[PDB]
Design a protein around this ligand. Structure first.
Ligand SMILES: *[C@@H]1O[C@H](CO)[C@@H](O[C@@H]2O[C@H](CO)[C@@H](O[C@@H]3O[C@H](CO)[C@@H](O)[C@H](O)[C@@H]3O)[C@H](O)[C@H]2NC(C)=O)[C@H](O)[C@H]1NC(C)=O
Ligand SMILES: *[C@@H]1O[C@H](CO)[C@@H](O[C@@H]2O[C@H](CO)[C@@H](O[C@@H]3O[C@H](CO)[C@@H](O)[C@H](O)[C@@H]3O)[C@H](O)[C@H]2NC(C)=O)[C@H](O)[C@H]1NC(C)=O
Ligand SMILES: *[C@@H]1O[C@H](CO)[C@@H](O[C@@H]2O[C@H](CO)[C@@H](O)[C@H](O)[C@H]2NC(C)=O)[C@H](O)[C@H]1NC(C)=O
Ligand SMILES: *[C@@H]1O[C@H](CO)[C@@H](O[C@@H]2O[C@H](CO)[C@@H](O)[C@H](O)[C@H]2NC(C)=O)[C@H](O)[C@H]1NC(C)=O
Lengths: 196, 196
């Protein structure tokens, strides 16, 4: 059990099958046997086939999929591949990340996740909100309901300060950090520009 | 309209898949197959291949696994989830009563929600109590890799637990939604006294 053949994609013939917003699904081939694999950094895919639409770096923000269909529009954070069990008994061995196992690859929408200490109350600068997380890395995002807004994920760690843009304070906008979620109310237009 | 996917006893229906916490079936009304997933196991007795249907489903807070490293420690069964098809087209599905497009995908799962294990339950030291603020909750003891297809226990409010000689070896592990716990191994010479 050494799926390191997926580590060598620089020189082995590989085809790009699918591309998500947070991982990549491909399959290499060494001695006449295909090896489906999923990676989170895409280091040796430059010479693969369909090595066309892939990015420099997946931002590595912890994300878990959606169970709440109703919460889709409220928690769309993009697409990420996950190891599912095949619909047939098919036990096809895929090596998600560095861990090998069987199952089938399946693309699912995901949500943000973790322990974002969303600091509602902030002493000074009420228009500036702070956000902390004990996790090593953590991701947040500000978006309206839906909008098909992908990316806009920020790799933050520990201390993080957030200010709102002029349009952003439209009440329908929502701040997503970790599991937690809040809604920003529309501030008065004349209270704005009074900052001067 | 997900009509007569609740009336499936009035239609010719084909049982496609059965998981631990939900069931997948397709009904046929007038020319086109309706794919639907549910949890009641009601009205599906007259469907085809409905031989191994469970009485009811536990319907506990349940999320799938991400880190494949933790399947062995947190395996609690299999649950059907709505995903996105690898190809472009996506058949409309009506999970519960919620209609949407996509494809089905079977995934093993972990218990979800929030539990608060009374870690130091001095009162009857060998019996401890759990409290869940949610309306329903799931829990089960399980050593890594132990076959657990329906050993779960539907949990609401606050309840207590009494252990077994098997379950008090150092290998068994306590599971309750979002929390994990390990059981210490009592010497078999101390076991014969608690047996009284
Ligand atoms: C699914 O993935 C598992 C993970 O490796 C694969 O399991 C392997 O299946 C083989 C069956 O050929 C088993 O190994 C056997 O062990 C016995 C005991 O020594 C030995 O006498 C046999 O000759 C054979 O080697 C075992 O279940 C397992 N091996 C592991 C985990 O090391 C399985 O092949 C995959 N399913 C597929 C590809 O359909
Ligand atoms: C899911 O597949 C079905 C069929 O392929 C589609 O579902 C429904 O499709 C209609 C047509 O696009 C959606 O909206 C309607 O659009 C027409 C455009 O002129 C408009 O006149 C109507 O007032 C209505 O807005 C409808 O929302 C959609 N519903 C669902 C539940 O899917 C559709 O192709 C696929 N779904 C999506 C979201 O694309
Ligand atoms: C991946 O590529 C490297 C580079 O060729 C392989 O390393 C070779 O290993 C074989 C022995 O199995 C020998 O040809 C040499 O020891 C290495 N090559 C050179 C040029 O020294 C490696 O085996 C490949 N496969 C894996 C799984 O890593
Ligand atoms: C399930 O089927 C029954 C059929 O007896 C439905 O009862 C009527 O169904 C027709 C459509 O065939 C509707 O037009 C009527 O309005 C229904 N009668 C009512 C609502 O009193 C029933 O609606 C179906 N759906 C369920 C029970 O959820």
């Amino acid at each position: 059990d050494l799926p390191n053949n997926c580590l060598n994609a620089s020189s082995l013939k590989c085809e790009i099958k699918g591309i998500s917003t947070y991982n990549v699904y491909y399959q290499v081939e060494n001695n006449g046997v295909i090896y489906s694999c999923v990676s989170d950094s895409a280091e040796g895919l430059e010479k693969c086939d369909n090595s066309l639409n892939l990015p420099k770096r997946f931002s590595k923000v912890p994300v878990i999929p959606i169970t709440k269909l109703d919460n889709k529009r409220h928690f769309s954070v993009g697409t990420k591949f996950f190891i599912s069990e095949s619909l047939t008994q098919d036990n096809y061995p895929i090596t998600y990340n560095s861990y090998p196992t069987n199952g089938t690859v399946s693309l699912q929408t995901v949500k943000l996740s973790g322990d974002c200490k969303i600091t509602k109350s902030n002493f000074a600068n009420p228009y500036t909100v702070s956000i902390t997380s004990p996790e090593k890395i953590m991701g947040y995002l500000i978006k309206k309901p839906g909008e098909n807004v992908e990316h806009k994920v920020i790799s933050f760690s520990g201390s993080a300060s957030i200010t709102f843009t002029e349009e952003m304070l439209d009440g329908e906008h929502n701040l997503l950090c970790g599991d937690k979620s809040a809604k920003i109310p529309k501030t008065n237009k004349r209270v704005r520009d009074c900052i001067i």
